[PDB]
Design an enzyme around this catalytic site. Structure first.
Site, PDB file in Angstrom:
ATOM      1  N   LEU A  73      50.856 -19.557   9.712  1.00 57.42           N
ATOM      2  CA  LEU A  73      50.955 -18.395  10.586  1.00 57.42           C
ATOM      3  C   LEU A  73      52.413 -18.049  10.861  1.00 57.42           C
ATOM      4  O   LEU A  73      53.129 -18.817  11.504  1.00 57.42           O
ATOM      5  CB  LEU A  73      50.223 -18.656  11.902  1.00 57.42           C
ATOM      6  N   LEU A 123      62.053 -15.059  14.496  1.00 58.61           N
ATOM      7  CA  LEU A 123      61.732 -13.636  14.463  1.00 58.61           C
ATOM      8  C   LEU A 123      62.434 -12.897  15.606  1.00 58.61           C
ATOM      9  O   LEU A 123      62.128 -13.122  16.777  1.00 58.61           O
ATOM     10  CB  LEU A 123      60.219 -13.427  14.558  1.00 58.61           C
ATOM     11  N   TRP A 170      62.251  -9.726  16.228  1.00 55.56           N
ATOM     12  CA  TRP A 170      61.474  -8.567  16.651  1.00 55.56           C
ATOM     13  C   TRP A 170      60.577  -8.916  17.834  1.00 55.56           C
ATOM     14  O   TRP A 170      59.996  -9.999  17.887  1.00 55.56           O
ATOM     15  CB  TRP A 170      60.636  -8.027  15.491  1.00 55.56           C
ATOM     16  N   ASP A 188      51.743 -10.417  18.674  1.00 53.45           N
ATOM     17  CA  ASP A 188      51.810 -11.614  17.844  1.00 53.45           C
ATOM     18  C   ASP A 188      51.782 -12.875  18.703  1.00 53.45           C
ATOM     19  O   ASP A 188      51.016 -13.800  18.438  1.00 53.45           O
ATOM     20  CB  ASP A 188      53.075 -11.596  16.984  1.00 53.45           C
ATOM     21  N   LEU A 189      52.621 -12.901  19.734  1.00 54.22           N
ATOM     22  CA  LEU A 189      52.688 -14.049  20.632  1.00 54.22           C
ATOM     23  C   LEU A 189      51.347 -14.277  21.319  1.00 54.22           C
ATOM     24  O   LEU A 189      50.788 -15.372  21.264  1.00 54.22           O
ATOM     25  CB  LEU A 189      53.781 -13.841  21.683  1.00 54.22           C
ATOM     26  N   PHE A 229      49.027 -15.426  18.955  1.00 55.29           N
ATOM     27  CA  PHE A 229      49.522 -16.696  18.442  1.00 55.29           C
ATOM     28  C   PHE A 229      49.049 -17.855  19.316  1.00 55.29           C
ATOM     29  O   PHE A 229      48.506 -18.840  18.815  1.00 55.29           O
ATOM     30  CB  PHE A 229      51.053 -16.680  18.376  1.00 55.29           C
ATOM     31  N   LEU A 245      55.217 -25.785  23.021  1.00 61.05           N
ATOM     32  CA  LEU A 245      54.298 -24.735  23.444  1.00 61.05           C
ATOM     33  C   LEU A 245      53.305 -25.268  24.477  1.00 61.05           C
ATOM     34  O   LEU A 245      52.745 -26.354  24.312  1.00 61.05           O
ATOM     35  CB  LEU A 245      53.548 -24.169  22.236  1.00 61.05           C
ATOM     36  N   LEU A 283      45.221 -27.520  11.615  1.00 57.77           N
ATOM     37  CA  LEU A 283      46.618 -27.497  11.194  1.00 57.77           C
ATOM     38  C   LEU A 283      47.130 -26.062  11.094  1.00 57.77           C
ATOM     39  O   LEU A 283      46.551 -25.234  10.391  1.00 57.77           O
ATOM     40  CB  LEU A 283      46.776 -28.204   9.845  1.00 57.77           C
ATOM     41  N   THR A 298      51.697 -11.916   8.930  1.00 54.62           N
ATOM     42  CA  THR A 298      51.798 -10.645   9.634  1.00 54.62           C
ATOM     43  C   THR A 298      52.936  -9.823   9.036  1.00 54.62           C
ATOM     44  O   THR A 298      54.105 -10.042   9.353  1.00 54.62           O
ATOM     45  CB  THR A 298      52.041 -10.882  11.127  1.00 54.62           C
TER      46      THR A 298
HETATM   47  N1  LIG Z   1      58.917 -15.471  11.825  1.00 54.72           N
HETATM   48  C1  LIG Z   1      58.752 -16.743  12.263  1.00 54.72           C
HETATM   49  O1  LIG Z   1      57.650 -17.214  12.804  1.00 54.72           O
HETATM   50  C2  LIG Z   1      59.632 -17.880  12.208  1.00 54.72           C
HETATM   51  C3  LIG Z   1      60.724 -17.569  11.582  1.00 54.72           C
HETATM   52  N2  LIG Z   1      61.766 -18.360  11.347  1.00 54.72           N
HETATM   53  C4  LIG Z   1      63.006 -18.090  10.619  1.00 54.72           C
HETATM   54  O2  LIG Z   1      63.075 -18.974   9.513  1.00 54.72           O
HETATM   55  C5  LIG Z   1      64.289 -19.764   9.596  1.00 54.72           C
HETATM   56  C6  LIG Z   1      64.039 -21.141   9.031  1.00 54.72           C
HETATM   57  O3  LIG Z   1      63.116 -21.860   9.867  1.00 54.72           O
HETATM   58  P1  LIG Z   1      63.633 -22.980  10.875  1.00 54.72           P
HETATM   59  O4  LIG Z   1      62.597 -23.332  11.866  1.00 54.72           O
HETATM   60  O5  LIG Z   1      64.984 -22.669  11.381  1.00 54.72           O
HETATM   61  O6  LIG Z   1      63.758 -24.216   9.791  1.00 54.72           O
HETATM   62  P2  LIG Z   1      63.487 -25.842   9.832  1.00 54.72           P
HETATM   63  O7  LIG Z   1      64.761 -26.533   9.559  1.00 54.72           O
HETATM   64  O8  LIG Z   1      62.792 -26.163  11.089  1.00 54.72           O
HETATM   65  O9  LIG Z   1      62.502 -25.932   8.584  1.00 54.72           O
HETATM   66  C7  LIG Z   1      63.002 -26.257   7.275  1.00 54.72           C
HETATM   67  C8  LIG Z   1      63.727 -27.581   7.307  1.00 54.72           C
HETATM   68  O10 LIG Z   1      62.830 -28.609   7.807  1.00 54.72           O
HETATM   69  C9  LIG Z   1      63.062 -29.825   7.117  1.00 54.72           C
HETATM   70  N3  LIG Z   1      61.850 -30.161   6.373  1.00 54.72           N
HETATM   71  C10 LIG Z   1      60.963 -29.294   5.783  1.00 54.72           C
HETATM   72  N4  LIG Z   1      59.963 -29.889   5.181  1.00 54.72           N
HETATM   73  C11 LIG Z   1      60.207 -31.239   5.385  1.00 54.72           C
HETATM   74  C12 LIG Z   1      59.511 -32.399   4.994  1.00 54.72           C
HETATM   75  N5  LIG Z   1      58.381 -32.381   4.285  1.00 54.72           N
HETATM   76  N6  LIG Z   1      60.025 -33.596   5.363  1.00 54.72           N
HETATM   77  C13 LIG Z   1      61.160 -33.615   6.077  1.00 54.72           C
HETATM   78  N7  LIG Z   1      61.905 -32.594   6.502  1.00 54.72           N
HETATM   79  C14 LIG Z   1      61.367 -31.421   6.120  1.00 54.72           C
HETATM   80  C15 LIG Z   1      64.277 -29.605   6.212  1.00 54.72           C
HETATM   81  O11 LIG Z   1      65.463 -29.999   6.869  1.00 54.72           O
HETATM   82  P3  LIG Z   1      67.036 -29.860   6.323  1.00 54.72           P
HETATM   83  O12 LIG Z   1      66.788 -29.373   4.896  1.00 54.72           O
HETATM   84  O13 LIG Z   1      67.691 -29.208   7.539  1.00 54.72           O
HETATM   85  O14 LIG Z   1      67.385 -31.400   6.299  1.00 54.72           O
HETATM   86  C16 LIG Z   1      64.194 -28.106   5.959  1.00 54.72           C
HETATM   87  O15 LIG Z   1      65.469 -27.558   5.610  1.00 54.72           O
HETATM   88  C17 LIG Z   1      64.668 -19.716  11.067  1.00 54.72           C
HETATM   89  O16 LIG Z   1      66.072 -19.932  11.242  1.00 54.72           O
HETATM   90  C18 LIG Z   1      64.275 -18.295  11.452  1.00 54.72           C
HETATM   91  O17 LIG Z   1      65.261 -17.323  11.099  1.00 54.72           O
HETATM   92  C19 LIG Z   1      61.756 -19.821  11.843  1.00 54.72           C
HETATM   93  C20 LIG Z   1      60.604 -20.194  12.522  1.00 54.72           C
HETATM   94  C21 LIG Z   1      59.509 -19.283  12.739  1.00 54.72           C
END
Ligand SMILES: NC(=O)C1=CN([C@@H]2O[C@H](COP(=O)(O)OP(=O)(O)OC[C@H]3O[C@@H](n4cnc5c(N)ncnc54)[C@H](OP(=O)(O)O)[C@@H]3O)[C@@H](O)[C@H]2O)C=CC1
Length: 162
Positions: A4, A19, A21, A26-27, A30, A54, A94, A116
């Site tokens: 999601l 995000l 926006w 959405d929230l 959500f 949350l 999940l 979305t």
């Molecule tokens: N529209 C939306 O709902 C959302 C949008 N976004 C956007 O997306 C961007 C990226 O998401 P964000 O939450 O910041 O990223 P995260 O760092 O939380 O997610 C990706 C990182 O998580 C770690 N990771 C992923 N999979 C695994 C795994 N299987 N085992 C261990 N570590 C793992 C890695 O860490 P690394 O590589 O750092 O070691 C990877 O780079 C955000 O900055 C934001 O701009 C973010 C969340 C929600």
């Protein structure tokens, strides 16, 4: 195993955090869906999240750090590890929210998809990751529009065949 997240025409999702926006619909929806369930979030997310953890829901953190301590939510660093947990929790579901690298891991181990797609075209430094669309069949699709032309979003469902 359902994903999601929000995105624009460019498939965006966030702007170096999340995000940007203001999507009230959405929230509201959500949290209304993530009530009494478990949501998996990436490292940068837990730190770059406005609501961490949350309320009235089960949070899950995914960071590489072995000595990471996430109070209020579950901590794990491997894809297989967290999977064992989800198994131990047959009374929950999940739901992946972020980040981009998180969706990637489960991208293969995923079963359902919930996206979305906004109407407005935004630009940032974080886009969605590739997915095996063929292996996934659309379960549902609903186009929601608001007063603003850019506030128009589309809810689509996907479930792996068989
Ligand atoms: N529209 C939306 O709902 C959302 C949008 N976004 C956007 O997306 C961007 C990226 O998401 P964000 O939450 O910041 O990223 P995260 O760092 O939380 O997610 C990706 C990182 O998580 C770690 N990771 C992923 N999979 C695994 C795994 N299987 N085992 C261990 N570590 C793992 C890695 O860490 P690394 O590589 O750092 O070691 C990877 O780079 C955000 O900055 C934001 O701009 C973010 C969340 C929600």
């Amino acid at each position: 195993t359902a994903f999601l997240w929000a995105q624009d025409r460019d498939g965006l999702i966030g702007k170096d955090g999340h995000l940007p926006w203001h999507l009230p619909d959405d929230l509201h929806y959500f949290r209304a869906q993530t009530v009494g369930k478990i949501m998996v979030v990436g490292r940068r997310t837990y730190e770059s999240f406005p609501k961490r953890p949350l309320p009235e829901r089960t949070n899950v953190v995914l960071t590489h750090q072995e000595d990471y301590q996430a109070q209020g939510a579950v901590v794990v660093h491997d894809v297989a590890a967290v999977f064992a947990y989800a198994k131990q929790h047959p009374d929950q579901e999940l739901v992946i929210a972020g980040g981009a690298q998180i969706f990637t891991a489960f991208k293969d181990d995923v079963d359902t998809l919930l996206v979305t797609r906004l109407a407005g075209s935004f630009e940032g430094d974080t886009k969605m990751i590739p997915l095996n669309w063929d292996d996934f069949t659309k379960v549902s699709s609903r186009t929601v529009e608001d007063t603003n032309p850019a506030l128009t979003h589309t809810y689509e469902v996907w479930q792996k065949k068989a």
